[PDB]
Amino acid sequence: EWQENKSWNAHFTEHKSQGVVVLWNENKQQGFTNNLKRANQAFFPASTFKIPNSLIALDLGVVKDEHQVFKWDGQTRDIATWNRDHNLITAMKYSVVPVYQEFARQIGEARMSKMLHAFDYGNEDISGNVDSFWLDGGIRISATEQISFLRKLYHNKLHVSERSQRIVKQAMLTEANGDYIIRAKTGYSTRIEPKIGWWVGWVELDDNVWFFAMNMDMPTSDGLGLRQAITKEVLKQEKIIP
Amino acid sequence: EWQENKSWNAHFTEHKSQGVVVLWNENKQQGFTNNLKRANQAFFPASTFKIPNSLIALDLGVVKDEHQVFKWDGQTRDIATWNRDHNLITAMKYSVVPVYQEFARQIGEARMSKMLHAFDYGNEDISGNVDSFWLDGGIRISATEQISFLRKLYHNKLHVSERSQRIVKQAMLTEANGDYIIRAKTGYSTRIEPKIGWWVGWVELDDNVWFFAMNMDMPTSDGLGLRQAITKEVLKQEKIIP
Ligand SMILES: CC(C)(O/N=C(\C(=O)N[C@H](C(=O)O)[C@@H]1NC(C(=O)O)=C(C[n+]2ccccc2)CS1)c1csc(N)n1)C(=O)O
Ligand SMILES: [Cl-]
Ligand SMILES: [Cl-]
Ligand SMILES: [Cl-]
Numbered sequence: 001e002w003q004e005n006k007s008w009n010a011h012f013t014e015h016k017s018q019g020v021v022v023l024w025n026e027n028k029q030q031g032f033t034n035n036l037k038r039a040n041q042a043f044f045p046a047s048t049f050k051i052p053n054s055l056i057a058l059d060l061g062v063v064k065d066e067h068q069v070f071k072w073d074g075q076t077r078d079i080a081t082w083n084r085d086h087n088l089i090t091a092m093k094y095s096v097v098p099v100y101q102e103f104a105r106q107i108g109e110a111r112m113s114k115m116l117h118a119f120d121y122g123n124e125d126i127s128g129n130v131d132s133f134w135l136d137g138g139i140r141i142s143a144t145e146q147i148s149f150l151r152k153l154y155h156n157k158l159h160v161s162e163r164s165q166r167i168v169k170q171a172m173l174t175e176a177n178g179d180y181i182i183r184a185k186t187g188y189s190t191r192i193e194p195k196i197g198w199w200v201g202w203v204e205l206d207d208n209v210w211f212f213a214m215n216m217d218m219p220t221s222d223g224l225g226l227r228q229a230i231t232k233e234v235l236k237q238e239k240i241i242p
Numbered sequence: 243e244w245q246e247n248k249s250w251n252a253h254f255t256e257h258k259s260q261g262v263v264v265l266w267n268e269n270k271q272q273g274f275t276n277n278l279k280r281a282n283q284a285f286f287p288a289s290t291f292k293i294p295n296s297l298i299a300l301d302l303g304v305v306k307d308e309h310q311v312f313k314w315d316g317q318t319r320d321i322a323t324w325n326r327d328h329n330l331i332t333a334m335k336y337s338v339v340p341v342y343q344e345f346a347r348q349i350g351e352a353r354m355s356k357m358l359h360a361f362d363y364g365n366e367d368i369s370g371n372v373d374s375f376w377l378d379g380g381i382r383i384s385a386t387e388q389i390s391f392l393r394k395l396y397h398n399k400l401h402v403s404e405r406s407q408r409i410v411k412q413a414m415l416t417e418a419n420g421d422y423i424i425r426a427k428t429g430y431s432t433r434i435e436p437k438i439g440w441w442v443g444w445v446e447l448d449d450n451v452w453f454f455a456m457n458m459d460m461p462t463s464d465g466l467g468l469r470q471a472i473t474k475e476v477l478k479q480e481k482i483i484p
Contacts, residue, residue: 090448090449093448162405163404163405163408166405166408166409166412167408173415173418173423175418175419176415176416176417176418176419177417178335181415181418206331206332206335207332
C-alpha cells in the first residue's frame with residue numbers, strides 16, 4: 001500500500017538536501033515515498049496549518065468569504081507582503097501569519113481543539129497559545145497524515161460545510177495550465193530544531209489526482225525554492241507532469 | 243467610461259487578422275477596447291455558451307457535481323478528445339459539445355429560456371434546436387454583453403445558487419501562476435457565417451480583476467491559438483500581466 005523508491009533521494013542529494021516526498025495515487029489507492037520512516041515522522045505544520053485554520057474560520061463565520069478584507073494592523077513586520085491589507089486568497093498566497101493569528105484568537109481554544117479532533121488532524125494537540133501553537137505549541141503532523149487530511153478535503157468529507165471546503169480549495173490554487181492543476185500550501189518551521197520546509201497538496205489531472213506531501217531540512221531561507229523544485233523533479237520522474 | 247485604444251490593432255494586423263478585445267477594470271469601473279463598434283456586435287456564442295449552460299445544468303440537478311461522469315455515447319466524431327468519458331471539468335476544457343447537448347435536452351426549452359432571461363444573456367433568444375441553438379439558432383451576444391454576464395458570475399449575483407456559480411468558476415480555470423489567475427472559455431462559431439473565434443473570462447490579480455472578451459475573424463482552425471496570444475499581448479501592453 002506504501003512502496004518505497006529510494007531513487008528519488010537523487011533529487012535531494014543533487015542539492016545536498018535531505019527530506020521526504022510522499023505521493024498517493026488516488027485512482028489506484030497506492031502510496032509512494034523515498035523514505036518510509038521520515039514519511040511517518042511528525043513535524044510542526046507551520047504555515048500548512050493555514051489550510052485547517054481557514055476551514056474553521058470560514059465554517060464559524062469568522063471569515064465571511066474570500067473577498068473580506070483583513071486590514072493591516074499598522075505594525076511593520078520584516079516580510080514586506082504582510083504589511084498591507086489581505087483577503088483569504090492573498091493571505092494564503094503570502095502566508096500572512098498575523099492575519100491567521102487573528103483568526104485563531106476569534107476561533108478560540110475550545111472551538112479550535114474540537115474542530116481539529118473532528119478533522120483527525122495530526123496529534124490534534126493545541127497545547128500552547130491559541131494563536132501560535134502551530135508554530136511553537138504542541139501540534140505536530142507527518143507527511144502521511146497530511147495526505148490523509150488533504151484527501152478528505154478533496155472529497156468534501158471534512159466536518160465543515162461543503163462551501164467552506166470549496167473556498168479553501170480555491171485559495172490553495174497555486175499553478176494551472178493545460179496539463180495539470182496544483183492546489184497546495186507551503187510551510188517553513190523555524191522556532192525549534194529541526195528547521196524544515198513543507199509543501200503539501202495535490203496535482204489534478206484530467207483522469208486522476210496525485211496527492212503529495214514533502215518536507216525537507218531547511219537550515220536557511222536560501223533553499224526554500226527547493227520545496228517545489230524537488231517535488232517537481234519527482235512528479236516528472238513519475239510521469240505525472242511533463 | 244469607455245476608452246478606444248486602436249493601438250491594439252497592431253497585434254491583429256501582425257497576424258493579418260481582424261477583431262476586437264474588450265477589457266474591463268473592475269476596481270476603476272472602466273472599460274477599454276480597440277473597436278467600440280465591434281465590441282457591441284453580437285455573434286453566435288458558440289462554446290462560450292458552456293458557461294451559462296453549465297450554470298443551468300448544475301442549478302437544476304441535471305449535473306450533480308463536477309465529478310459526475312457523462313459516458314461517451316460510442317459514436318466516433320472528428321475531435322478525438324470527444325470520444326471518451328467526461329465530467330464537467332474535462333467537458334469544458336475540451337469543449338465537448340455532445341455532452342452539453344445532452345444537458346440542454348434535459349434542461350428543456352422552457353427552463354432554458356427562463357434562465358437566459360433571468361441572466362439577461364445576450365438577446366435571450368433560444369430559437370431552434372434546444373441542443374444546437376448556441377451554434378446555429380437564434381441566440382446572439384456581443385463582447386460587452388459577455389463582460390456584463392461574466393461580472394455577475396464573478397460576484398455570485400446570477401439567479402442560481404452560489405454553489406453552482408462556484409463550480410462553474412472552478413471549471414473555467416485555465417491558467418494560474420504567481421502573477422495571475424485566468425478563468426475563461428473559448429468558442430469557435432463554425433456552422434453559420436461569419437466564422438469567428440471567442441475567448442472570454444477574467445484575470446484575477448492580487449488587488450484587482452480584469453474582465454475580458456475578445457472575438458476575431460477565424461476562417462480556418464489553424465488560427466485558434468491567436469485568440470489567447472493576441473489577448474495576452476494586449477494584457478502585456480496594458481501592464482496587467484508581466
Ligand atoms: C456530423 C460530424 C461530421 O460532425 N459532427 C459534429 C461537428 O463537429 N460538426 C461541425 C460543427 O458543428 O461545426 C460541422 N457541423 C455543421 C452543421 O451542423 O451545420 C456541418 C454541416 N452539417 C449539417 C448536418 C449534419 C452534419 C453537418 C458540417 S460539420 C458535431 C457537433 S455536435 C455533435 N453532436 N456532432 C461527425 O463528426 O460525424
Ligand atoms: Cl448537432
Ligand atoms: Cl479554482
Ligand atoms: Cl473553441
